[PDB]
Amino acid sequence: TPVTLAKVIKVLGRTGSRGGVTQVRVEFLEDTSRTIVRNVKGPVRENDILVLMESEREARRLR
Amino acid sequence: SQVFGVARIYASFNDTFVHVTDLSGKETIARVTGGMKVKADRDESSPYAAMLAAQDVAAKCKEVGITAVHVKIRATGGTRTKTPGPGGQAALRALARSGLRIGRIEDVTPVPSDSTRKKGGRRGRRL
Amino acid sequence: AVGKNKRLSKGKVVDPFTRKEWFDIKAPSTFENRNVGKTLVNKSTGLKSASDALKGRVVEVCLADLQGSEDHSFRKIKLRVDEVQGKNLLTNFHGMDFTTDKLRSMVRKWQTLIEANVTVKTSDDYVLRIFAIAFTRKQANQVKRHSYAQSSHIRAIRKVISEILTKEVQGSTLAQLTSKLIPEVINKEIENATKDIFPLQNIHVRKVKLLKQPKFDVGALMALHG
Amino acid sequence: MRAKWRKKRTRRLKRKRRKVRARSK
Amino acid sequence: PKKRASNGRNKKGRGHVKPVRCVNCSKSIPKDKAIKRMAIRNIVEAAAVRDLSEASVYPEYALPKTYNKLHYCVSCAIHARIVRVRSREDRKNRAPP
Amino acid sequence: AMNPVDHPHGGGNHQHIGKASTISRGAVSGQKAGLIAARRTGLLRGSQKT
RNA sequence: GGUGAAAUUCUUGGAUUUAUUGAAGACUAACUACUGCGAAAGCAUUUGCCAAGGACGUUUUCAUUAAUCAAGAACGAAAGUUAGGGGAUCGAAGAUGAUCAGAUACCGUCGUAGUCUUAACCAUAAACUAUGCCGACUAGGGAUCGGGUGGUGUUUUUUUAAUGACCCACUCGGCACCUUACGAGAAAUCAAAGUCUUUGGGUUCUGGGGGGAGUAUGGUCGCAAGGCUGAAACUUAAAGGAAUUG
Ligand SMILES: [Mg+2]
Ligand SMILES: [Mg+2]
Ligand SMILES: [Mg+2]
Ligand SMILES: [Mg+2]
Ligand SMILES: [Mg+2]
Ligand SMILES: [Mg+2]
Ligand SMILES: [Mg+2]
Ligand SMILES: [Mg+2]
Ligand SMILES: [Mg+2]
Ligand SMILES: [Mg+2]
Ligand SMILES: [Mg+2]
Ligand SMILES: [Mg+2]
Ligand SMILES: [Mg+2]
Ligand SMILES: [Mg+2]
Numbered sequence: 112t113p114v115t116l117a118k119v120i121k122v123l124g125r126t127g128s129r130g131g132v133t134q135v136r137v138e139f140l141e142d143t144s145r146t147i148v149r150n151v152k153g154p155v156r157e158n159d160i161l162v163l164m165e166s167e168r169e170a171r172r173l174r
Numbered sequence: 175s176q177v178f179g180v181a182r183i184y185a186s187f188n189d190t191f192v193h194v195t196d197l198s199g200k201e202t203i204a205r206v207t208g209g210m211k212v213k214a215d216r217d218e219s220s221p222y223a224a225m226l227a228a229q230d231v232a233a234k235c236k237e238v239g240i241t242a243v244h245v246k247i248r249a250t251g252g253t254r255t256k257t258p259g260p261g262g263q264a265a266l267r268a269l270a271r272s273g274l275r276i277g278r279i280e281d282v283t284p285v286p287s288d289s290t291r292k293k294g295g296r297r298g299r300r301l
Numbered sequence: 302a303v304g305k306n307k308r309l310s311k312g313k314v315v316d317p318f319t320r321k322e323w324f325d326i327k328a329p330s331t332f333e334n335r336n337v338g339k340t341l342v343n344k345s346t347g348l349k350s351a352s353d354a355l356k357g358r359v360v361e362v363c364l365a366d367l368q369g370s371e372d373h374s375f376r377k378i379k380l381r382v383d384e385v386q387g388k389n390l391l392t393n394f395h396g397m398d399f400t401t402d403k404l405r406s407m408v409r410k411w412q413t414l415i416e417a418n419v420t421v422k423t424s425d426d427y428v429l430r431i432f433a434i435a436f437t438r439k440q441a442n443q444v445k446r447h448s449y450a451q452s453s454h455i456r457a458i459r460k461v462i463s464e465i466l467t468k469e470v471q472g473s474t475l476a477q478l479t480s481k482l483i484p485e486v487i488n489k490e491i492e493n494a495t496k497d498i499f500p501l502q503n504i505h506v507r508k509v510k511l512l513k514q515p516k517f518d519v520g521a522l523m524a525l526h527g
Numbered sequence: 528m529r530a531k532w533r534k535k536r537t538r539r540l541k542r543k544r545r546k547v548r549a550r551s552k
Numbered sequence: 553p554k555k556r557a558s559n560g561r562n563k564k565g566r567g568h569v570k571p572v573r574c575v576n577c578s579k580s581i582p583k584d585k586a587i588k589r590m591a592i593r594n595i596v597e598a599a600a601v602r603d604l605s606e607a608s609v610y611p612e613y614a615l616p617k618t619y620n621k622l623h624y625c626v627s628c629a630i631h632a633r634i635v636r637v638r639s640r641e642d643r644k645n646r647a648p649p
Numbered sequence: 650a651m652n653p654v655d656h657p658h659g660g661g662n663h664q665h666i667g668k669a670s671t672i673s674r675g676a677v678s679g680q681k682a683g684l685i686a687a688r689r690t691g692l693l694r695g696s697q698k699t
Numbered sequence: 700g701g702u703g704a705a706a707u708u709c710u711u712g713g714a715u716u717u718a719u720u721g722a723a724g725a726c727u728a729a730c731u732a733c734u735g736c737g738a739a740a741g742c743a744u745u746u747g748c749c750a751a752g753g754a755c756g757u758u759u760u761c762a763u764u765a766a767u768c769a770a771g772a773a774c775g776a777a778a779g780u781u782a783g784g785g786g787a788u789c790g791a792a793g794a795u796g797a798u799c800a801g802a803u804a805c806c807g808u809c810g811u812a813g814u815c816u817u818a819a820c821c822a823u824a825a826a827c828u829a830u831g832c833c834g835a836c837u838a839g840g841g842a843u844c845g846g847g848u849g850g851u852g853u854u855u856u857u858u859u860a861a862u863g864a865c866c867c868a869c870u871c872g873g874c875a876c877c878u879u880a881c882g883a884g885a886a887a888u889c890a891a892a893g894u895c896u897u898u899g900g901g902u903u904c905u906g907g908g909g910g911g912a913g914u915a916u917g918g919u920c921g922c923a924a925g926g927c928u929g930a931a932a933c934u935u936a937a938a939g940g941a942a943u944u945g
Contacts, residue, residue, distance in 0.1 A: 145602075167271075168222055169264065169599070176609070177323075178338050180361070182717065188701065191716060197326070198358040198382070200718045201341035207716080209302030209700095216704070218302055238318055242609065247595065253788090255575065256620060257591075267600050270607035277609050278363055279595055281401045281618050287744085288728040290788040291814090294578025298625070300805055301577075301703095302700095310711055357719060365610075374614055381719095402595070405619030405729075414730045417745080436730085440865040442853060445843085447732080454863090459745080496855055497863060537914080538925085544915095553887050553941065559828085562733050565874050567741055568776080572728090583731075621729065646733080694811055696786040 115166040116140045117147070119159040126150065126173045134172055137161060148172050176242040176275055179203065179235070183228075183269075185262025186250045190224035192231050192265050194243050204234035208261050224261030228268035235274060242275030251284035253292045258283075320344035326360055327391050328380065329525040331480040332367045337380065337392065358382045359395055368483060375403040377508075383522055391526050394479050398508040407503055413437045413450040415501070417459045419466045425474040426515040431466045432507030433491070438500030454499045461494045476525065482506075556643070561585040574625035576632065587624035587635060592617055657682045 117137040126134045135155055136148035149170045151161065180199060184191030190208030195201065209218045211226040235241070245266065249258045270276050322344060326337035337360060345351035364376035377398035384391050408414060418432045435458070439448045450458075469487050470478060481487060488504050495501040528536075561584045563569055569582045595616045596604055605612070630636045638645075653660035657680065661667065666683075674686035684690065 167225060167268070169267075180717090184716075189715085193716075195717060196341045197338045197362075198340050198355075198360050198718075200355075200358050201321075202717055203341075205716060211303070213303035213305070215302045215305065216702090218700095239323075263597055263600065266596060267603055270600075270604050274607075275609050276604060276607050277613070278366075279604075279608075279613065279616060281595060281616070283401075286726085286728065288726050290725060291790090292573045292578050293789065294573070295790075296580045298574060298577040298579030306710085308710080312712060359719065371610075371614075400616070402614075402616040402618070406617070408729055410730060410732075412730075416730095438864095440854070443865060444867095445865090447734090447843090448864090449732095449734085452735090456746095463746095499864065534913095537912095541914095542924095554829095557888095558733070564733065564828090564876095565735085567737080567739080570743080584733095588731095619729085698786090 115163050117149075117161045117163055117166070119155065119157055119161065120146075121157055122155050123148070123172070126171075134170075135161075136172075139166065177240045178277075179240045179243040181243050181245040181266075181269060183245065183247055183262070183265055185247055185258030185265075187219055187255065187259045189218045190227060190259065190261035190265055192224070192228050192269070194231055194235055194240060196240075197244075203238055203240065204231040206231045206234075208265075219259045219261040221261050221264035224265040225268040228265035229272055232269050232272035232274050242277060243269070244277055245269075245279040246282045247279070248281070249283040253286060253289050256283060256285065317343075324355070324385070324388055324390050326380070326382070327389050327526055328362075328367065329393055329476070329479070330527060331476050331483070331525075334367045334369055337362055340382075340390065352385055355382060355385055355390065360392060364483065373483070375400040383517075384519070391522060393522060393525065394475065394511075396508065396510045397482060399505070403505075407434070407436060407505070409436075411447045412439075413448075413455065415450070415455050415458055415462075416507075417462045417466075418507075419463050420512070421467045421470045423470055423474055423478070424472060425521070427475055427511065428513040429470065429509060429511055431470070431509045433462050433466060434505065434507045435462075435491075435495075435501050436503045438502035440500060448500070450499055458495055458498055458501065461498075462491060465491055465494065482509075572623050574628055575623050576628040577625065579625040579627065581623070581625045583623075585626070587626065587629040589622050589624065589634075591620045591622050594618075 117139050119135055119137050121136065123134040123136055126132055132150050132152055133155055134148065135151050136146065138144070138146040140160075147166070147169065149161070149163065149168075178197050179194035180197060182191075182193055182195050182199075191205070192207070193205035194203045196203070206227040208220075208223045208227050209215070212218065212220065212223040217223045235243070247258060247262060247266070249256050249262075318341075320343045321341050324340045324342060326340060328335050328337050340355065340358065340360070342351050342355050343349075345354075358381075360380045360382060362378050362380060364373035364378055365371055367373075367378065377400055379395040379398060380392040381395035382390050383393045413436070415435045415437075416432070417434075418430060420428070420430050422428045437448050437450055439446075465487070469481065469490070473481070485505075488506055491504050492501065495504075558564070561569075561582065563582070563584050566584070569584050571580050571582045572586060573579070574581055574586075594601075595618050601615065624632065624634065650664060651659035658666050670683035671687045671690065672681045672683050672685050676685075
């Protein structure tokens, strides 16, 4: 069960029709400078540390 | 120094076809489609579904031995939508990151010289 | 779409690659790069004769891989496997092509496209169809912004292009012509006959397709792969 | 009702009349 | 009452214009009345280059671009996050944004 | 319009064939009357698709 | 495969997919545009032949031959009819799957006529610019197509000329456009929809409250479908147009 740790640089905004999910773009701690935008459910800041069971999807970024 | 193949990926709506082929094109390796991975029939073309199919074709290459592969993205073509599906690109990023060597990326979707007739009738698909 | 296969058999395991052996494609003479790549054929049994099973393949390559210089990036080439021997199956020229991106990038509106084609035959009776394309150009100091042709230039230019293509094939058998498309000498040559008519920028010729080929004549092919 | 369809409704009707009058002449 | 001086299109002295099919719903529509927009995009992604660069021989290969012309019918174009609706005075602005 | 002594169709209280008029290719002389070894019947619709 | 989501449908007899090759029919992409032509319907691959047309140039010719037009004639999208050819794709009818309270509908899968061509009909359309045609005059400005004129102008040949492509200025005709309202209008809006109570340049057609009704009948044309011509009884005080605020 490979597990990757990602850190938040900044939070992009809130998405979803309901408005509970926020759009956050992060980077992998190990193998830095590799960054990804993913969707998170709970309250967030910068510098948060997320746990991703998978680290390979590009989430839907509202644009 | 690297053995080639042709990715021959089929970006489309409602599915995703990815399969490396020998440079001639006659001999085929690891034809895996996007519907093989999700038992929902609704995520047939979903990016995650396409991603899984690309890995297995990439994974199945090592056993054969081919290491590098040319890329040919290709939409529905013909008198159809002519625009690659959402699972179209997530497979490509999956193919490159899984280790194979990419070269000669190109678009090969068939464009007609004002072909026969498009389905939908005069007033189109009223909804 | 996994657990929905209602039925498999209407009337009612070995790895395929266990007997697959790689070959090598051998490009013709007038290409600096020689190792085209590899192919797959299953093992030739006593009855299958898989040696004959691959004489018909058509392999796909680009001049950038044949001349090694990105200036020929698009420059698509189709090679036809002609005869196989000693793991070094030999190919020959089948037809040139343009990439999709290049062909669409050249076509911008506010100008006039001119296209032409001919069905000349070579000295060695190879029958070829050469397509030729062009676009008009805005003269420097131009104020008006479209620069369309007068639709009698397009008639006149098309006549000149067709004569040039006929000249450049006849008297040239197959390979000098192959070594004439690589330097794009014909592209530069046509521009000599159109500047007195109209600017005609961007004269990259087009795909050229092969229609009918003469008798095999093992010897002629042997010359290419010296 | 729509003008197109009322004109069509008449046309079918004039077929019935043009036929029943033929039973007489 | 007349809504437009061209009334839908850019046909002045044409007689007829040989329609084209809407690429979203196949609704037939004259070429000049359509909502032609050009779609050019990187062949891969605006972000995949960070991965398709390393995973490619021939460094900095070409990053080629796909090309397509998109005709939209008024019904689809208005619905599809496009030209939708402007003020009565703003209807006269032909300058693209 | 013939009698049953005359033709496979002949006879009846109404003028009717009685059995399918499509005869097999393997029938014998005297049994082959009507349409012989027909693949299809009825009015032709669409292209022949030969 | 299809879809918002599924089901019918084709699938171990190898579908969808990949390669090479072949056939058939239709279409003429991107270029393609406040661009071109035509009396109008209409017309966009290449070349050849056949005849035509405008605009321009003109110190050529005839000399009022003209403008508009009942009757009358030609052409006349699509669909539709008749008979051969053709018959890919799409697809009135029809058959199916789903949705729904129902769904003989919209969505999906099939699919006949039709779609194409030949010979002959039909004679209509939001056939629209909803703006009859000819003529004169009334404000500016940018841009474009065709032809012409001048500029030691730029460019390419043979540094060099002529031409061709450009640039500047002007002009004749066309497709249009932008600002203004002196003027017009019920107003939206109009360089014509102005020069109309200070009401007359020539001329053809049409209209007269809303329904009944473009109906009945009678002619006439048509293979038919249907076209053209076309009332009366009766019933009613409002139908309507353009803008304003909700
Ligand atoms: Mg309105
Ligand atoms: Mg019209
Ligand atoms: Mg198969
Ligand atoms: Mg033009
Ligand atoms: Mg064309
Ligand atoms: Mg009428
Ligand atoms: Mg009218
Ligand atoms: Mg006048
Ligand atoms: Mg002008
Ligand atoms: Mg001029
Ligand atoms: Mg014009
Ligand atoms: Mg009155
Ligand atoms: Mg009245
Ligand atoms: Mg009103």
